Amino acid sequence: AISIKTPEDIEKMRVAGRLAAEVLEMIEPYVKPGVSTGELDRICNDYIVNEQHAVSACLGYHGYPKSVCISINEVVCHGIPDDAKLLKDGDIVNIDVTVIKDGFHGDTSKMFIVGKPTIMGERLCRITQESLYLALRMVKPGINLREIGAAIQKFVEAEGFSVVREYCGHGIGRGFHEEPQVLHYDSRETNVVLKPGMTFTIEPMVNAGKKEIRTMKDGWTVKTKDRSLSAQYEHTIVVTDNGCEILTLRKDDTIPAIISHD
Ligand SMILES: O=C(O)c1ccc(-c2ccccc2[N+](=O)[O-])o1
Ligand SMILES: [Mn+2]
Ligand SMILES: [Mn+2]
Ligand code: NA
């Protein structure tokens, strides 16, 4: 059941969200040509455990083997860190982190462009982040999630891209995935009116090509059916009385932590 977080819980969410965002800030320098997704994962976990004194929520979730998800180019999500997978020039990579601190979760991801960026890669990532931003700018009490989902899709599709249907944002707090589901496209099933105190994520997965995906035989790795590029950005937020506050904001984000509509 969708719950309203207390001022105390919200503060714990701010701490967890900050830590998650800081893992992404910390790993940035390591995302260079020649590094393996495997070592990047080890680097993230060492930081989370030893420095943040927190724990990755992904490690073991539904059986996930690693601490963070790392997806490259045509891989849509759930890419498994591998010691034999090296980043290369032109690659676009998503690193998705979720940490648990004092009982609460912080969930966020971002795209990193490796080496010399490609105009196409750079555009898919920019548009994807912008679809997330426009959605965040719509968040406030009274609005229906169906509206936000419809807006993301409309913006993305106008760019000639597509929105992955199999995955969605979600409520979050003491649990990794709580209600409600946050669809990134228009669905006749969606009907959720936002209220202050609600905490959830927005994390659109955008394909340069067709929306259809395929799961690899390792039971986790998801790729675009047509093998086109795919990007995703994610933030955890809390609905306020007149808008929202992004709990996982990073220094490289080009959107304010607090979004006011007064
Ligand atoms: O951002 C998320 O909500 C997210 C990322 C990855 C997962 C997830 C979901 C189901 C099973 C395993 C994972 N995971 O992170 O290992 O959820
Ligand atoms: Mn995530
Ligand atoms: Mn999430
Ligand atoms: Na990708």
Side-chain angles (χ1 to χ4, degrees), residues 40 46 56 81 94 101 120 154 214 226 241 245 247-248:
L40 291 180
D46 288 331
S56 157
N94 176 285
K101 182 61 179 175
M120 69 208 42
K154 189 183 177 180
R214 284 272 180 171
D226 60 4
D241 293 310
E245 164 174 31
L247 311 173
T248 55

Side-chain angles (χ1 to χ4, degrees), residues 106-249:
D107 190 2
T108 184
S109 81
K110 65 165 295 178
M111 297 302 290
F112 298 80
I113 305 298
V114 188
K116 187 195 178 192
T118 66
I119 283 61
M120 69 208 42
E122 179 173 58
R123 186 174 298 160
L124 173 57
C125 293
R126 183 185 58 181
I127 294 305
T128 299
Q129 180 179 61
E130 184 52 52
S131 75
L132 167 58
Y133 282 1
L134 71 85
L136 292 171
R137 288 193 293 271
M138 297 175 80
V139 177
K140 71 174 183 173
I143 194 175
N144 203 299
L145 286 185
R146 185 177 175 177
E147 293 183 60
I148 301 178
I152 292 176
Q153 165 178 40
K154 189 183 177 180
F155 178 73
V156 171
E157 296 185 341
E159 298 307 308
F161 299 140
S162 63
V163 179
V164 174
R165 309 295 172 78
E166 289 80 354
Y167 309 86
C168 56
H170 50 83
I172 181 175
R174 278 179 176 288
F176 191 174
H177 300 81
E178 316 180 321
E179 286 198 65
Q181 299 183 66
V182 185
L183 266 43
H184 304 113
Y185 62 94
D186 179 60
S187 183
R188 311 171 60 182
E189 197 193 331
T190 304
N191 184 347
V192 182
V193 181
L194 296 181
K195 305 166 289 296
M198 286 177 78
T199 54
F200 61 92
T201 68
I202 303 181
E203 44 181 300
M205 284 177 202
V206 181
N207 293 346
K210 304 191 182 190
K211 62 177 182 298
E212 288 68 44
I213 63 181
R214 284 272 180 171
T215 297
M216 296 302 93
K217 298 185 177 181
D218 62 3
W220 287 106
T221 305
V222 179
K223 289 184 176 183
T224 53
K225 188 182 191 182
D226 60 4
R227 298 302 189 296
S228 61
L229 294 171
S230 181
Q232 171 179 45
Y233 277 83
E234 166 178 30
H235 270 313
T236 291
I237 68 179
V238 63
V239 183
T240 64
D241 293 310
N242 65 310
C244 75
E245 164 174 31
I246 302 171
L247 311 173
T248 55
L249 198 80

Side-chain angles (χ1 to χ4, degrees), residues 58-78:
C58 296
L59 189 64
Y61 193 68
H62 284 54
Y64 189 70
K66 295 290 182 175
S67 301
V68 291
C69 292
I70 300 178
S71 310
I72 306 169
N73 302 327
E74 72 286 346
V75 176
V76 180
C77 62
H78 303 170

Side-chain angles (χ1 to χ4, degrees), residues 32-35 72-73 85-93 114-115:
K32 47 163 170 290
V35 65
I72 306 169
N73 302 327
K85 186 58 183 186
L86 306 309
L87 294 185
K88 62 192 173 187
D89 192 74
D91 276 8
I92 66 179
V93 183
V114 188

